[PDB]
Amino acid sequence: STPLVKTSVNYSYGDYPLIDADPHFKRVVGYMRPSDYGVIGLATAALPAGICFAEWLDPVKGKFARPSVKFLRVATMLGFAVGFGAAYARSSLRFFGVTENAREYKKDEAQMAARKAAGLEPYGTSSLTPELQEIAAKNSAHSIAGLFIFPWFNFVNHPYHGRE
Amino acid sequence: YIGAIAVLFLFIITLLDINSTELSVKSNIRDLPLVLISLIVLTISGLMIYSNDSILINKLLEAFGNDYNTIITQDWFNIENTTLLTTIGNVLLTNNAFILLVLAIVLLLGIIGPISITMKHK
Amino acid sequence: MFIGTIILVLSFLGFVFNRRNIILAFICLETMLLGINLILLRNSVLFDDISGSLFAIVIIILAGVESAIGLSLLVSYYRLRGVINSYGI
Amino acid sequence: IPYSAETAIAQNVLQRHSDTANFYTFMNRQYGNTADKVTKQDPQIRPHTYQVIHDYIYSCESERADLAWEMYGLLHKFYVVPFADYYKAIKFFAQDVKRQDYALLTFQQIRKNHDLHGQPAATSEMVAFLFHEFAKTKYKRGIKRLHEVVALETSFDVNRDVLNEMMAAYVSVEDLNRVQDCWAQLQQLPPSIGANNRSVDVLLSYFKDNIHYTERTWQGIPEFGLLPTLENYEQYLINNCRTGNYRRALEITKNMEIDSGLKPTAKIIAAVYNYTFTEQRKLEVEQWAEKAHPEMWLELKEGDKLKSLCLPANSDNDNVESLLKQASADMDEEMSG
Amino acid sequence: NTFIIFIILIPIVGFALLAVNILLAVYKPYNEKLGAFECGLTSFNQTRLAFNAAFILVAILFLPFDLEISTLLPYVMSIYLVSNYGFTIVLLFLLILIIGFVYEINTNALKINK
Amino acid sequence: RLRPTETTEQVLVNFTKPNSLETVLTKCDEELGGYSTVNLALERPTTGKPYGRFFGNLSLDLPKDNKMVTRSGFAMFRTLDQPSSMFKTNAWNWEQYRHLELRVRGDRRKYFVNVQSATPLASDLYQHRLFIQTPGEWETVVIPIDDFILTNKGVVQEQMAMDTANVYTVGIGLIDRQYGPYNLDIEYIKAVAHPPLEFKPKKEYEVEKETILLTP
Amino acid sequence: MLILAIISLITFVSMSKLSDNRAIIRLINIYLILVLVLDSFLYLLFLNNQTYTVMGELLIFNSFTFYIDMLIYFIMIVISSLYGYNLYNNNLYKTLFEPKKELIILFLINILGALLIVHSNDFITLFVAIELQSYSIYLITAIYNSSYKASKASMLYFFMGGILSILIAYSINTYYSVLNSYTLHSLDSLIINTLDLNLILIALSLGLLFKIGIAPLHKWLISIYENTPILITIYISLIPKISILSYLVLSNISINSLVISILAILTLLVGSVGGLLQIKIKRLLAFSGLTNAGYMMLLLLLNNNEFSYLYYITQYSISHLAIFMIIIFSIYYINYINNQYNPIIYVNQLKGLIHDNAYLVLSMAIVVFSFIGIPPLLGFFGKLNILMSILNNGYYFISIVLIVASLISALYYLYLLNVSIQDKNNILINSNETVSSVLSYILSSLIILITFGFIYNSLIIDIFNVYFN
């Protein structure tokens, strides 16, 4: 769990304190606000609603025909996908100290306090060699900036989170 | 390049021959004048150097020579039986895994495209 | 590099002149890619660096995909499928 | 086997069991793999096993329409089929139940035999008929297929009748270029053989929503040396009605019997009522009818021919001309069956 | 160095190709009996032949699929060094390729005459 | 202004001129071992416009002097192949015509309008039959450009659109599988742009009417 | 968000009928709309011009890349709306604008290639993205292969782009041979001063700029644009140009380049003068794009040009989409259709359009004036930013060439309006069919953006000053 290269300490990505430069996927989902789940449901209902509204505005074959259940289900799955991506990005920018993250900061503080009390490592221990840990951290560093393009999440318990 | 690319080249050409379909041979004399103009321009560009060639052609002169042999030294810093393909796999799967995924999308394109432009759907 | 650069030069000028010999032009594309790969591999060997060889294999894969797409284009262009659809719907 | 037994044997297989798989196997034992080219049994010698196939071929319904195709194939491989039977099969495999793919292939069958074997060639009567059948189901694929067959034909040629139905085929698929192309070829022909009432009938139907070109088409009829017919007047009345000219339509119907002597029919008067989309203008249509055509109206009330489709109430938000398109488009479906 | 070789080699072989191509300027004007092809007559009576799109698709798609397979060779040579991270990357690579394989299976693009 | 010229017509086979015949060549099956004959005349009589004459015999007998052939008996004429030497255009541009009109007296023979245009293959031909409606009298038969059917070796093929930007030659030929003399008198062939909709028979042919239009 | 869309489209389109193409394209239209409106908050990552490196230094991420990315989604939404939504509900318009089964997948893969071009930080990633975009755009050009006019353009574009990509790879490998590196992070002021790698970057810029078609290699792409279907031409003539020009702007490898300046002047002159010699709409718009490309290439000669380039590329994208959509809408008001793929060819076919749809002609007049640069439209302000940037660096002859080119181009721009405001006595063969409400709304939104985007000039300037400095 010993880092191999030097990393920035308490770097400020915004106007809020840094919680985790490269938070884990389970970490990001666990630190998710109810508003983010509201966003997920909003998108999950919006794509089918968007399809229905587009059908109402301009029917495909002239006559108004509601889309078949297959299109509704595909739109529901894609809506859950886009909502989950937006929620993950919002939680990440909370971790990056860009938006308001006071409650997340307090939960993070209590969490590593409990972990240190239990006698564990701060960001986990891995199945990967330290070189692979560094490669994973360098690949997944700030990968949320490309949410428009590709999905990529940190599934490696690497120590390169930019904290003390 | 041989068992796939060249095989497919020869396959496609053989498809053109069994039912004899001679390919029409168009005249390139249409494009010859532009080649004339461009190549004369390039020769003139190489020509007005003249005096400056005495300090530039010499670079190529010692470039051609290369009359020194590389010295090969041995060391024992390597213990693992690592070959070139192993290093390729390591870099492509860890350092440049994103490139591997984008080439996966490229192969996906190479699968989809021929299907899209070769068959008439329904 | 000598051999790669000269293959590239010869194939490039074969492409520029014919330009209407689609079989031979596409062959020249393949040979120019081969000539570039040779230069890249030689420089990778000289520098003892893996990036040259990695880019070489990437160029190989891209060249294969490009060749597949181009041969599909030639199939569509020359109507290799044949017709014999006479007396049919 | 003896011929007399074969009559009852074959009759039991098809009409009583419809065992198509068994039916194919039986004849390969009597005549025997006619691809061997040894027998071409003449129906004229004994049209008994020929008839039972001929009866079941021309009796299949929409569900069994596929089955009629296989039985047609055996009828031609085994027995020589008269050329006059081609007309019945083409009309059967098209204008009879549902299927039009076999209409083209039946026409293609005449072509293949004429080119290779030497059978008598197809006449232009089928392509004129088969265009008309294609212009009923809006079959875009068959029209393109048949056109290029016509464009490279060394047996029959294009005449007045082919162009008329070819033009009608293109109106169904809405091809503004091909429609004008066929009109140029008809126009450049002498009126002796050329632009007829069928030509005007298609041409008016293609200008159904253009009042300007419908009118100039109407003045076209006197120039070509023609007198409008009852089927010709009806579409003109529809076109005037569907573009909001309700009032002008009545004067045309009122004065048509004076001008031409062609008394208005039920399919004319019911058409004017159907395509008038104003509740008061619909009333003025049924003002002369009670006192000029009393007997022939009364048989339209119980036949459900009259339809009271009109324009919405708070519909002044949209264009009136846009309403007439939607009202007439709905009315076209109601009169399609 | 490659640029230098390129630039100086361009004029020499360029002029050589220019001269050898100004040669065909007039040659074999193909005065062969091209009369039956400018009319539309056929003299084969046979040799129709056919090629289903699936046949040429098998031939063409041999190449991208072979590239997909041969891309697995670098992985099996470093399987232990990149064990779990590389295992996940190869799983994603294979799933992406199987997306295209599913495309070619569902489309039934590769089924020869039925 | 100074833009490329736009026009509604382009004469392909003009005839009606002292030279005329220099613009076209002929090809019968004498190129093969066949016995069909082709010959192009030039008639310039009075009380009318001078026209070309395209006659001959189309004996379908096979060439009993060789064996690799299977079917013979053609006779055609075409415009001279487009001279593309070093600098000129290369071919014809038909991107603003959509029609080709030709004025001709016909007979019982079945002629084909043959068009040669740019194509990846060599022997591809765009051909549409010349429908002679009125035999013995002149008719301006119009053929839409985007209705020619692509044929290679005489076989209908994958119907891809003509390359109207690059057209080489236009001609009329006989591939009719019937014996006997043939004749066809042409006096022009031109490609004509889209005509606006008209509702009169023609100005060249007319029928008795009231003549509402004021006389000049 | 794009990879998942590509995978889901392959899976769904595999198991769908041909009639579901419109519905699938609509689904992706709303999908991309929600991606923009719901994930737009990611712009908070780039306060004070903060920059990130992603995927092992293989990708770069900043406000410039984010803005080009969002613009590419907006353009993709508009173009995909042009395919999913039916302009007129009749069989003719059914036939003309019918999407292919794989067209949406190819579109998204080409968008992915363009974005990877914009976000590239390494020459290996740059080349891979270039090859992805090139193969996708070849397949886009060739997917309508029922005509020889389109087939010749497809084959020419394949071969010319193959030569260009080979030249790009050769330049990249020469750079690697010189420096044993594949990234620009090894280039500094000392590196440029000490060693002569300028020619390598000139060759790379040459190969990249020829892909979008600057002079003297403009004729092939102009022929391709002329011969491809117009719904394909609207896409193939905007997105690759945006990707290449954005990569060139962010790379910043052509400071005060004599070769780049001369080629930009040549491009401007050729585009302006050759436009005067055009009677076809497609060729005229191709030369218009050439002139705009020359204008944007003039911005490659100086630093701190992010605002001017961004403003000009956004306004040009909007105007390009608007002008092609106006040409598409005008198809209904002509008496005949040239081809199934290109239904309108000559500018003369638009003659008298003011008597069929006066407001369509008004919108076209607005977009043409914005192309010319008449205030207060967005085109004038983009050209003004270009002029300010070039005068800040002392390129006076370049400014004179720019002004002369604009004045010359105004002639063939007003050619369109003068033809369209004529009188056509030939009445239509079609009447009263209603045009699509969604596409009409999108066109009107584009026109209103062009007309009244100058309201937010100060707001955009402040946002740029706070997010790019």
Ligand SMILES: CCCCC/C=C/C/C=C\CCCCCCCC(=O)O[C@H](COC(=O)CCCCCCCCCCCCCCC)COP(=O)([O-])OCC[N+](C)(C)C
């Ligand atoms: C509900 C979420 C929907 C958001 C989707 C946005 C898609 C953008 C797409 C296509 C461009 C259309 C015009 C965008 C305006 C520039 C915004 C900006 O301010 O430009 C700056 C950079 O200025 C520049 O360099 C030059 C920009 C050139 C603009 C040229 C067009 C002028 C006319 C447009 C005026 C807007 C009219 C709105 C009427 C209500 C980027 O700002 P930023 O990176 O800090 O993030 C912005 C925060 N955002 C992401 C929430 C929006």
